[PDB]
Amino acid sequence: GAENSVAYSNNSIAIPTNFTISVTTEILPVSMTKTSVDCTMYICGDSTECSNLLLQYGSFCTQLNRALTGIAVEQDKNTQEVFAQVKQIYKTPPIKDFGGFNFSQILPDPSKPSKRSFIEDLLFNKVTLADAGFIKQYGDCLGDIAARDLICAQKFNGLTVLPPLLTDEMIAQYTSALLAGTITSGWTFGAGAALQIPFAMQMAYRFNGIGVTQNVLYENQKLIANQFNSAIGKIQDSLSSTASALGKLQDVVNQNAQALNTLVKQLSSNFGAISSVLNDILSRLDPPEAEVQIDRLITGRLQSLQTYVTQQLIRAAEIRASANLAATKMSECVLGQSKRVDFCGKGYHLMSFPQSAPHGVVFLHVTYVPAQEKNFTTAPAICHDGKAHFPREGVFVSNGTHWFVTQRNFYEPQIITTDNTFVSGNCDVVIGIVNNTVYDPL
């Protein structure tokens, strides 16, 4: 990183005079492809004798089907925990009078057949799935034999992919409900009932939550709305530019596809047998020896399945941890406001917006970042009549001739008064106290 130094001193403080509203994108996996394996078709494809030999392994199989079923269930639980945290479906009002804040690029547009936002459409257009549909009829792979499609080769070997319980439309509807709740009711819909509030005023609260007096927002409301709209436009331009931004989600798709393709390739292995092809053994050897070679192939292919399932269980644990993190963020950033540093983006967190994505969630984190800082000379306290006056909430600064007190995160100098400071003890103990005067209102 770049090397720099900070001008530290015992009587100098840097205070921001301006700020920027930034929007960051955090991408998290939530689910991964649900799989199901028919041990008989994979190991003993269309062979009754092999299946009959295989039946004494019924337990190794049923424990593999249980593990994969458990994974598929946990993928649906993960999705439900991330997106289904609101009991009711909220809808936006017909009038978008949000104080100048433009949400048209994140709220659903009713004119498309699936009520997704434009940014969500971009997300679906950057990550490319493998199945592209959960129906693949026998005639559709019967006539594509000229074509080496991977899905057909999987399905002929007992390897299938189950559809998710929650479709992209249902997830989009949940994210729409979450946006309408956060925008029209702030955090109140998370705790209990959705309590309507003007958007600008909730932003006044969000500013108070980060130590910035609400009058700053109202005075700069036009600037804040313009910075937000520009940040959203920049997010749109970024997602529209490249594709690797969502690599974290694409890798999940790729890993699952790779595992299945790898599994299919393992069928070419002999595992010590004279041939990997069951039919060549059966067509050349009589049962007493075909059975010796075949038990070996059954063992090898069962080990391959065991390896696959183990890898899927480990990845499922990885996805679950990511999904739990995503649910935590949904709860503590979208439904509330986070004081946890860098949990919901860099800066002082204001609010977040969920967007759905294939096998994942994208959070748009709106944060307050100090933009232009200044060097002021400061003091921890001022002596007046021998009394030591301290700020209740803020710091003392001087422009070189006059002492003022101001809010910590935004330069807003105030005259030193008895209603801003408090007295405790006297000036002769505290180190670095300076002399000034404190005005007493009539």
Ligand X SMILES: *[C@@H]1O[C@H](CO)[C@@H](O[C@@H]2O[C@H](CO)[C@@H](O)[C@H](O)[C@H]2NC(C)=O)[C@H](O)[C@H]1NC(C)=O
347 scored as a contact of a second copy (CB under 8 A): yes
Contacts of residue 187, Cβ cutoff 8 Å, sequence gap at least 6: 335, 336, 337
390 makes contact, choosing from another protein, ligand NAG, ligand X, none, with CB < 5 to 8 Å by partner type, with none
213 scored as a contact of a second copy (CB under 8 A): yes
Quick one: which of 113, 109, 112 has its CA closest to 96?
109
112-171 positions binding a second copy, by CB under 8 A: none
Considering beta carbons, is residue 200 or 246 the nearer one to a second copy?
200
Q: Which tokens go with 338?
A: 């986070």
279-318 positions binding a second copy, by CB under 8 A: 292, 295-296, 298-300, 303-304, 306-307, 310-311, 313-314, 317-318
105 makes contact, choosing from a second copy, ligand X, ligand NAG, none, with CB < 5 to 8 Å by partner type, with ligand X
7 scored as a contact of ligand NAG (CB under 6 A): yes
Distance between CA atoms of residues 22 and 345, nearest Å: 9
In sequence order, what are the beta bridge partners of 35?
A: 161
Quick one: which of 37, 10, 5, 82 has its CA closest to 329?
82
CB of 277 to another protein, least distance (A): 5
221-260 positions binding a second copy, by CB under 8 A: 221
For residue 332, the 8-state DSSP code is: I
Residue 351's CB is within 10 A of a number of other CB atoms, namely 23
Q: Which tokens go with 37?
A: 């394996």
Question: Dihedrals φ, ψ of 114, to 5°?
Answer: -130, 120
399 makes contact, choosing from ligand NAG, ligand X, a second copy, none, with CB < 5 to 8 Å by partner type, with ligand NAG
317 makes contact, choosing from ligand X, another protein, a second copy, none, with CB < 5 to 8 Å by partner type, with a second copy
Query: CA 348 from chain center: how many Å?
Result: 18
Instruction: Tell me which of 102, 266, 275, 306 binds ligand X, using CB under 6 A.
Output: 102
206-235 positions binding ligand X, by CB under 6 A: 223, 226-227
Stretch that binds ligand NAG, among 116-124, 322-330, 336-344, 372-380 (CB under 6 A): 372-380
Contacts of residue 81, Cβ cutoff 8 Å, sequence gap at least 6: 323, 324, 327
Residue 257 gets the label, from left (phi > 0), alpha (psi -120 to 50) or beta, of: alpha
Instruction: Tell me which of 104, 340, 415, 417 binds a second copy, using CB under 8 A.
Output: 340
192 scored as a contact of ligand NAG (CB under 6 A): no
Considering only the C-alpha atoms of the chain, give the largest distance between any 2 of them, rounded to a whole number of Å: 112
Stretch that binds ligand NAG, among 3-11, 167-175, 303-311, 322-330 (CB under 6 A): 3-11
375-394 positions binding ligand NAG, by CB under 6 A: 375
Quick one: which of 324, 317, 311, 432 has its CA closest to 381?
432
Distance between CA atoms of residues 111 and 116, nearest Å: 10
3-62 positions binding a second copy, by CB under 8 A: 56-57, 59-60
Angle of the 287-329 helix axis to the 247-265 helix axis, nearest 10: 170
Considering beta carbons, is residue 341 or 369 the nearer one to another protein?
369
Instruction: Tell me which of 9, 11, 12, 18 binds ligand X, using CB under 6 A.
Output: 18
Q: Using an 8 Å Cβ cutoff, are 49 and 405 in contact?
A: no
Distance between CA atoms of residues 428 and 234, nearest Å: 55
Instruction: Tell me which of 105, 160, 255, 377 binds ligand X, using CB under 6 A.
Output: 105
Considering beta carbons, is residue 113 or 288 the nearer one to ligand NAG?
113
Interaction site with ligand NAG (CB under 6 A): 7, 10-11, 95, 97, 135, 373-375, 399-402, 431-432
